[PDB]
A paper describes a structure:
Here, we report cryo-EM structures of human H1-containing tetranucleosome arrays with four physiologically relevant NRLs. The structures show a zig-zag arrangement of nucleosomes, with nucleosomes 1 and 3 forming a stack. H1 binding to stacked nucleosomes depends on the NRL, whereas H1 always binds to the non-stacked nucleosomes 2 and 4. H1 contacts DNA with L1, the amino-terminal part of α2 together with L3, and α3 to stabilize the nucleosome and contribute to chromatin compaction.
In all structures, nucleosomes 1 and 3 form a canonical stack, whereas nucleosome 2 is located in a DNA loop between the two stacking nucleosomes and is rotated relative to the nucleosome stack. H1 is absent from the stacked nucleosomes of the 4×177 array, but is present on nucleosome 1 in the 4×187 and 4×197 arrays, and is present on both stacked nucleosomes in the 4×207 array. Particularly high Δβ values are found for entry DNA at nucleosome 3, except for the 4×207 array, which is the only array where H1 is observed on nucleosome 3. In summary, as the NRL increases, nucleosome 2 moves farther away from the stacked nucleosomes and the trajectories of linker DNA at nucleosomes 1 and 3 progressively approach canonical values (Δβ = ~0).
Numbering used by the authors:
A (entry chain N), B (entry chain R), C (entry chain H): 30 to 124
D (entry chain M), E (entry chain Q), F (entry chain G): 10 to 118
G (entry chain L), H (entry chain P): 20 to 102
I (entry chain K), J (entry chain O): 37 to 133
The structure:
Amino acid sequence: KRSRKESYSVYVYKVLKQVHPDTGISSKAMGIMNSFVNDIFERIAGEASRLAHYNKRSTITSREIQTAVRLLLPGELAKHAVSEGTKAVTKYTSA
Amino acid sequence: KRSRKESYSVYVYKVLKQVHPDTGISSKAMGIMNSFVNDIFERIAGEASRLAHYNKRSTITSREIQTAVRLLLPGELAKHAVSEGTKAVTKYTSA
Amino acid sequence: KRSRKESYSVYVYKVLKQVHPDTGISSKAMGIMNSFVNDIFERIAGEASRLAHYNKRSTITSREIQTAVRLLLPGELAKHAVSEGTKAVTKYTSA
Amino acid sequence: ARAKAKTRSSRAGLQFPVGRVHRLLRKGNYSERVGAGAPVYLAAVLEYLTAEILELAGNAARDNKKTRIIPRHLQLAIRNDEELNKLLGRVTIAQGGVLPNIQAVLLPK
Amino acid sequence: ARAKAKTRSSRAGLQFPVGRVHRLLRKGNYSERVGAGAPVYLAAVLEYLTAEILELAGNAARDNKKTRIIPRHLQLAIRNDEELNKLLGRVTIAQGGVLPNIQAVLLPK
Amino acid sequence: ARAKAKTRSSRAGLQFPVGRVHRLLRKGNYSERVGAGAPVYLAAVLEYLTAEILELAGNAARDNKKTRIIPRHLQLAIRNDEELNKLLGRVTIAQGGVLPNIQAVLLPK
Amino acid sequence: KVLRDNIQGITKPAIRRLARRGGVKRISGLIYEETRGVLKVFLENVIRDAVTYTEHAKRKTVTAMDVVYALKRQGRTLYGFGG
Amino acid sequence: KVLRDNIQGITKPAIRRLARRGGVKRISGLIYEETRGVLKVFLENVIRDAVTYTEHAKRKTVTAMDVVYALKRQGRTLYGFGG
Amino acid sequence: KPHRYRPGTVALREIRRYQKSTELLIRKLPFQRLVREIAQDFKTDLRFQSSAVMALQEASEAYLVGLFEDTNLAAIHAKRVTIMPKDIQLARRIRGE
Amino acid sequence: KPHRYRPGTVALREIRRYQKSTELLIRKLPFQRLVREIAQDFKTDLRFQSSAVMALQEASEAYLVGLFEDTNLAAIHAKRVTIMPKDIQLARRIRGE
DNA sequence: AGGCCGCTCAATTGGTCGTAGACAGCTCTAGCACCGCTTAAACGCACGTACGCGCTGTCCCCCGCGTTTTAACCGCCAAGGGGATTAC
DNA sequence: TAATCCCCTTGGCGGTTAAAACGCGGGGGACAGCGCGTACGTGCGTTTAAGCGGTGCTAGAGCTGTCTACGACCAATTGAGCGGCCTC
């Protein structure tokens, strides 16, 4: 065999079957969404590091991530992301 | 009672009087210099972090910094900086 | 059994490999370097001796050599020459 | 005597790997400690964007009567969402093509 | 009983702090570990860069018959150097104004 | 017993021998007593001058697709610099040749 | 204490002065309101980022460092204000 | 061993087809050579960084992932080749 | 007769006079009032460091100057000197706004 | 009489087709040789993954099409249907290059 | 500004301890080189036809040159907000 | 997070033109209809090297064992470097 390389194949596929059970996906588009999730993850991660620097915070919390979302994400994307993450963090807080 | 705020005043003053003993300075010019040194410092530092990540390096060395110089710093300034940096690490290893 | 003959070989080699790490050396070009070093050294030393005579100073310091550079070396190079000389005496006094 | 090893993505009711994102941020040099809800919130945001994009991609595939996600569909979906557009203005899609854009001055009388 | 305190900035013979730049790189969360030549190389680069900045500022001040650097001199120093311009194309300067720059069509005849 | 010694060239951080230039000044019959900054100043001047001319020779060698310096490169480097020509107007160079120089009346048409 | 029409507080001759610093000789009548609108949009974006910073900083006073970081995130980095 | 002219290999009808994809209806004959020049400049800017990555990687074979790094540095991030 | 310069002469004098100038071209108090005005919409009772107000002032001034540089490049591209807001919109949209 | 289209019609059909189509419009192998000859201009005897060659390709045509969209914006701002290189030079200055 | 005086923190050093990647070295695999058949490319010349822009004119639109006025600016005064600092 | 304090921001006030504002003569600006040399799209056949497809191989890409450089970190100690001030 070879070394296992982490990718986002199965999670994107689960989410796809959540939104579209009936369809397929090309591997080229799959690599594009891998690049997408890695790129946006890097943008938000760097922005959260910037704000943790600005507030002199040694720890990046969901407050910082929410601030970075409100910075980068436009308008309704930002507020529904806030709603989704808030619902998720309440469910995880309630386990 | 006050808290110290660190700035690069005395070093830029030193090298200014080294290269122009007769030349004065204004303080807001020094503010622009502080903004410059922090700006270029964070550019080079972020690029060095990127190169450490790309080549799976947990340690940022002079090779990373020189690579970042060839990337960001264009052309002639890059070659001069390489030259005095090579001199600088050389005399540093001899010291 | 032979006797040592001194030259300026390794220093010009070091300087060339600093400014051009990949450039080679022909031996008679190196003879031109040794003769050039000896020639310019004798010119500046004679000028320093004459200035020491004319100011009745029995000691030739960096001021005499600086005057000699201002005299013999024409302009733009002489200005740069004063620049490394000032930086060198500063770093030598600091060391 | 440990209980069942449950997954934090399902603890959030979500699909994106919470453990992977938290480990990446621990190894990404952004903060040495990461707040507990930070990767959960991040994965929720990532899944929300990914879900809406995949929904648009499936709808665009259905629009051109195809059943498979294509990078052309990704271009035609993301570049036609203006907030995703200025979210991703300087980002290139491989083999995505371009938006159908004719200037009205280029069209004949 | 102890080695004499002789700083690494003096070891470089350079005025920029090896120690302060090193601690800002370590604190700046770029990697937990940093090679020894990295901050000395960086400080050499920074001090050299500021050296040509100070040269151009000095000649700009000497041109406008003032002995003191004003940010107008900084404007004239930065924007008249093509590599510095490529370094600082997107950088804004306080109270610097612009280059003396008129297009040829604006002149009479 | 004894402090470990560095050369004064290393104390300057310059490649030219400060000690050798100092002894050739003291034994060259120019002054019986010599100030301390004089030989380091002169040695820095000489090293900078040789650095410039070696840079010029290296670029000239790269122009002629030759890896190694030749005295033809030295002749081209000296005679094509104005201030170096002022330094070496009366200096003869072994195996150097001359500049490629044809007067305008010598050329046809 | 409420303010209503201070976009007109950036005066027409101030617009002319800025275009002189921009080197603009002749300025149409349609220019000024469009400049007001685009500067309004730019300011809205910048102080939106700055207000986000300030509420994330749990502060009430807008600071110039927040202005600096907001301009950095829009690729309009400013020197000379404590950055 | 060496090659002297392959910038000609980015042919004139290829430029024409791209300008059709770019939406150009009429293309001057002066367009093609200067478009070759500016793409030449851009590819030099990219590949200089990519080579810098490559000897920073101690490799002799150029990979696509460093091309992605160089493009992301220059603000022209490409999706479809990462990892 | 009173002295009258031809149209554009005083314009060019303003060109040279404000390129040599370094001072801010906006009145300070209405600009501060405007930033308080717009920021009150996003968050109530906001207070401003005056230095932050002049920072916004100078940054906005230079951003507008860069905008009019792009604009009059488009105008000399468009063989005009009377710039019109479509030039600014061209500069913005080619810049990506 | 053999059939012939009026000018712009095949240009517009090509415009529509390659806006619809997504494929590369340049031959891959001369592009690869150009990549290698400019590689040896920086470092001789480099080897290139084919994926790197096509990745550099789609990056190149995307950059190009962005410049040509800006070129059409300038040309319609220059009130024209035929582009000239000064449009591209203008757009290159507008992007800050 | 700058230069001088008082504080303080930071920067270093010696050692120590953990560890990172450089180096060697294998291996195996895709890039490279070579070879062969096909036809898209391409390109080049002819020609139809539309392009860019300028002359003249034409219509109108801010620019310049004032006067008036008013509130911005500057100087002065009172309030307290909150920001930052220390401790828990 | 509590306290708090102090200093830095915010509101109020009195004049003062600086700045805005309004208006009017006027030259310039923008630019369209038509013209006119033009410059390039389009046809379409030909050439050739790209494209496809088919082989051989080892350069180096990538993976694996070592090992020593290599550098972070703590107590201490110092010396440079910043807060403060005043002054020419």
